[PDB]
């Protein structure tokens, strides 16, 4: 689910990505059809630009934090960081260094909340490069004739099954993380040239790569499946199988 969503009807999966050069916001939301001059309100009311920024930038940003509020309720953000800030706040009048040591855990908490509440964004150009290399998909789909019917991608709540992923039964990791940082979704595609449709289901997880501490890829498709439907032919293509992928690589277990 897209966390940043306004009353604008068009391009829901691009609303957070597109950076408009508008000085202020348009008078009306993008019209879905030709309207009458009396449908819209001439000379919008006073303080309209301030109202639009609150309902198109502020409010959907808070709805994003509220939608994914379960990813920030860890003992580190809830107890440790505010508890540390209160310890130094009692000596805020003694010196300046206590004010900084009492505000830093607050800024650190905001940064963890800011990054964890964003929409999960995978490298989509890697994905389309992967499906266009498969011969069974390029038989019915092409970049010049494909269109998106539905898109869904959201983090998975809580810790997963403690047999498929024993990594998350770590008390040190659970102190900082309440979720698994893995995401799951699908892609409803259609081809206007061949008339075929497919549901591209995928599961992602962060993996380590080539280095000791840095994550290699935060959204690695460890399961990638395509249920292609045609006129009278139903094909099932398996690009990445999880039984073969989970034996080679394991999740990353973000901290902080």
């Amino acid at each position: 689910q897209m966390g940043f969503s306004s009353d604008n009807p068009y391009n829901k999966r691009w609303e957070y990505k597109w950076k408009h050069s508008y000085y202020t916001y348009p008078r009306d939301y993008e019209h879905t059809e030709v309207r009458k001059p009396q449908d819209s309100k001439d000379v919008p009311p006073i303080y309209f630009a301030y109202y639009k920024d609150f309902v198109d930038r502020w409010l959907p940003g808070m709805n994003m934090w509220w939608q994914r509020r379960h990813r920030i309720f860890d003992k580190f953000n809830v107890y440790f960081l505010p508890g540390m800030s209160l310890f130094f706040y009692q000596f805020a009048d003694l010196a300046l260094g206590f004010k900084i040591m009492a505000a830093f855990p607050l800024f650190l908490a905001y940064t963890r909340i800011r990054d964890k509440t964003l929409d999960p964004d995978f490298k989509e150009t890697y994905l389309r490069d992967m499906i266009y290399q498969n011969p069974e998909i390029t038989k019915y789909f092409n970049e010049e004739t494909i269109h998106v019917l539905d898109y869904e991608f959201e983090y998975l709540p809580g810790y997963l099954c403690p047999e498929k992923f024993p990594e998350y039964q770590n008390k040190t990791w659970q102190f900082f993380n309440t979720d698994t940082a893995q995401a799951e979704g699908f892609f409803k595609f259609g081809d206007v040239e061949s008339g075929a449709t497919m549901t591209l289901k995928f599961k992602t997880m962060p993996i380590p790569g080539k280095f000791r501490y840095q994550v290699g890829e935060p959204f690695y498709f460890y399961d990638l499946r395509a249920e292609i439907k045609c006129d009278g032919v139903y094909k099932e293509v398996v690009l990445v199988d999880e039984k073969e992928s989970l034996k080679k690589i394991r999740p990353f277990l973000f901290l902080i």
Binding site: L94, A95, L96, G97, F98, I100, M101, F104, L108, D115, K123, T125, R128, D129, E143, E144, I146, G209, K210, F211, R212, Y213, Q214, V215, G216, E217, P218, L255, I256
Partner: protein, 120 residues
């Protein structure tokens, strides 16, 4: 067909949280030495990068330096009050020793400090 007009030459970086993931931190930076101990390993494990760690220690350092400057202001005589009383009487003992052996002219000025080695 936006991907048709996508330029793959932007794949030179993998930007995520304002950090390039294809950064050889095993050969450059504070994370290059592999002889780091348990504390330094767990510290780099939390931040995953040296650029983020150094940025936070920049502000925590100002707080720690300003705090220890206060504790040495309020406190300090617990450890340094003896070396001040020692130098207090020492500052008076050599002053009195100077008046005993020093040439004073008709006005109270030691105009011959280089008369002998003990005078200097």
């Amino acid at each position: 067909m936006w991907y048709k007009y996508f330029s793959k030459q932007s794949w030179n970086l993998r930007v995520w949280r304002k950090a390039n993931l294809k950064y050889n931190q095993d050969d450059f930076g504070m994370t290059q030495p592999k002889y780091i101990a348990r504390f330094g390993d767990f510290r780099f494990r939390l931040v995953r990068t040296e650029g983020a760690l150094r940025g936070c220690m920049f502000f925590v350092g100002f707080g720690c330096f300003s705090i220890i400057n206060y504790l040495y202001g309020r406190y300090g005589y617990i450890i340094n009050e003896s070396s001040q009383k020692r130098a207090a009487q020492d500052l008076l003992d050599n002053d009195m020793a100077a008046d005993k052996i020093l040439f004073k002219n008709r006005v109270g000025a030691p105009t011959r400090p280089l008369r002998s080695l003990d005078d200097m």
